[PDB]
């Protein structure tokens, strides 16, 4: 989507492996706030929005 009309995807009721994304060589930016990127797989959330 264009940034003025950004696209929101709701994620729920699933297993979230964030190491697949974090340990990827294909991303130039991966900045986490309020949470450490290496502790994400130890956490549970009530919802994730992408």
């Amino acid at each position: 989507a264009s940034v003025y009309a950004w696209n929101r995807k709701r994620i729920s009721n699933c297993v979230a492996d964030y190491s697949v994304l974090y340990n990827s060589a294909s991303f130039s930016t991966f900045k986490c706030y309020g949470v450490s990127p290496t502790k994400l797989n130890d956490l549970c959330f009530t919802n994730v929005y992408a």
């Binding site: 949470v35 450490s36 502790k39």
Partner: protein, 49 residues
């Protein structure tokens, strides 16, 4: 009410303890009042703050 003088002492101390316990639920500016939640989410460089 005859023994109010003794009951007041009990009430004041019980109240002080209850207040002290309740303060553990305050964030004081932190993301969470729960120490374990901070430690489970953040690494030391940020957790310590």
């Amino acid at each position: 009410s005859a023994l109010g003088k003794l009951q007041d002492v009990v009430n004041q101390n019980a109240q002080a303890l209850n207040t002290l316990v309740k303060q553990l639920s305050s964030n004081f500016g932190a993301i969470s009042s729960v120490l374990n939640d901070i430690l489970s989410r953040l690494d030391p460089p940020e957790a310590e703050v």
